Ligand SMILES: CC(C)CCn1cc2cc(Nc3cc(=O)n(Cc4ncn(C)n4)c(=O)n3Cc3cc(F)c(F)cc3F)c(Cl)cc2n1
């Protein structure tokens with residue numbers, strides 16, 4: 001009842017955020033058990049940032065070059081290593097607030113909560129999707145580097161994103177917690193364009209079903225379509241393909257509303273071809289693609 | 302595009318959420334120091350909910366009738382009283398997770414973060430605004446009663462909202478933490494309609510400032526207006542009149558952009574009278590009214 005972008009409660013992640021400093025370079029780190037994870041960019045001086053050789057830079061550091069602060073408490077670094085684009089600092093104290101967790105790599109279209117932090121202090125939380133072009137449309141200022149994205153299932157935090165940089169278009173790029181970038185980006189201060197982005201079809205459909213559950217129904221029609229014919233139109237409008245697995249995941253929303261998946265596809269097809277002609281859906285003038293089927297079911301049921 | 306609804310980190314509030322049960326009637330409570338605050342509706346049986354005599358129902362209760370639980374841990378109630386529409390249950394344990402806090406009563410237009418909870422268990426966090434008709438366009442399912450809204454300013458949590466009920470239109474009504482309703486609503490299970498809503502002028506102005514900051518300024522014109530003349534026009538388009546306080550909270554955005562508040566008012570006045578004429582602001586044909594001047598500075602700066 002009502003429909004908004006809803007994040008996971010952030011408390012389990014807040015207790016893990018720390019500040020990491022190397023020289024004067026500073027950013028956010030994630031403290032789990034006796035390891036702090038942060039972007040390896042922190043080992044760069046100003047001059048290093050443009051074109052770093054990270055293996056070279058790291059070999060020139062020792063443990064005592066790293067200042068880790070949890071609030072006003074300094075954590076002594078007793079080991080360091082690098083895993084792809086993520087620096088791992090072993091410290092001499094276990095974080096008592098460490099939740100149950102895993103590191104996962106998400107797929108385009110999947111959503112997650114971001115805890116934006118500055119100087120190791122959490123500032124805000126919101127929901128994001130990994131775009132098909134592997135950027136995120138985040139809300140991040142200077143100093144947000146190392147902020148994390150996550151999902152919570154029961155008591156377990158699945159970390160899926162660590163923030164590195166803003167691109168010239170104002171979208172954002174980062175890695176998983178194993179230090180591999182999402183997308184064709186590199187951890188260097190040079191201008192980087194992303195590939196052309198597409199709309200997340202299965203998510204638009206999920207959001208149309210949310211609209212129906214909340215009584216907003218003007219866009220339904222009685223056409224139907226084959227999956228293939230819908231996919232031909234979607235592709236033409238820079239929408240991702242809809243797979244049979246996607247059709248399957250929409251099953252519960254289809255059953256709840258009595259609207260067959262391919263009928264909702266026919267509705268979306270007409271929205272693409274005819275536009276919304278000044279009308280809104282769930283208060284939006286645009287087709288929203290950053291709610292997954294799971295997101296809709298959790299917020300509606 | 303650019304701005305999104307961002308919530309405060311919810312951890313400081315998560316540690317205060319409990320469950321309160323009286324018979325089978327169950328909802329969420331807020332545990333601060335040695336007091337649990339919750340909606341007094343919890344003392345209603347099914348047959349009471351339509352037209353409760355709360356003084357009568359409470360006289361029949363003792364401390365022993367209240368089950369307060371932090372997860373599955375019972376907190377023993379040692380005192381009880383009622384202040385307006387909130388029940389205050391004194392318990393024998395001071396919450397060690399109590400943050401620095403205060404209770405505040407907000408005005409229409411002001412935004413806050415909501416921590417939606419079910420059975421004392423946080424489920425999600427999102428931002429929303431108090432509408433001029435004293436409702437909120439929340440996202441709440443059955444069992445959300447007693448969920449709270451808040452702002453965090455320098456490690457102090459300002460609690461501003463406790464959720465009570467959904468109205469027939471799907472919008473939401475509740476009290477401050479002293480148990481006084483926002484708007485003309487009462488805590489009984491009868492259809493109550495909200496008064497006709499209006500657009501939050503001070504927030505639309507904040508959003509025009511946001512647009513200017515980001516270089517989108519086609520709508521600035523060569524005119525000005527008095528506040529009174531503006532207010533008279535605004536009401537003709539179902540926009541809220543501005544208060545002196547509203548003028549004052551636009552001060553920082555005015556200073557940052559060099560655009561006088563009354564000049565921006567004259568700009569909005571022309572938009573109201575003449576329409577958008579095909580143009581967009583921050584990528585949208587709709588003027589956003591749920592971002593406060595404070596929200597804009599937070600996200601821009
Ligand atoms: C005395 C100290 C206070 C100050 C010293 N100092 C200056 C610093 C500058 C830094 N650079 C960045 C910080 C930052 O928060 N974001 C995120 C962001 N998001 C939205 N915006 C608008 N910015 C970045 O994009 N960059 C650039 C950047 C990061 C990379 F990881 C990468 F690989 C390449 C890159 F170009 C960092 Cl990481 C540490 C610093 N320390």
Ligand SMILES: CC(C)CCn1cc2cc(Nc3cc(=O)n(Cc4ncn(C)n4)c(=O)n3Cc3cc(F)c(F)cc3F)c(Cl)cc2n1
Pocket residue numbers: 001325326327328340342343441442443444445446464465466467487488489490491
């Ligand atoms: C699980 C059961 C076995 C246990 C029994 N039980 C049945 C209950 C029913 C209850 N009533 C409500 C719960 C609830 O979450 N929301 C919020 C909401 N938001 C969006 N939706 C869709 N619902 C409500 O609006 N009401 C109605 C309501 C609340 C008031 F405080 C008020 F003053 C008047 C009112 F009509 C409560 Cl409070 C406790 C109960 N316990």
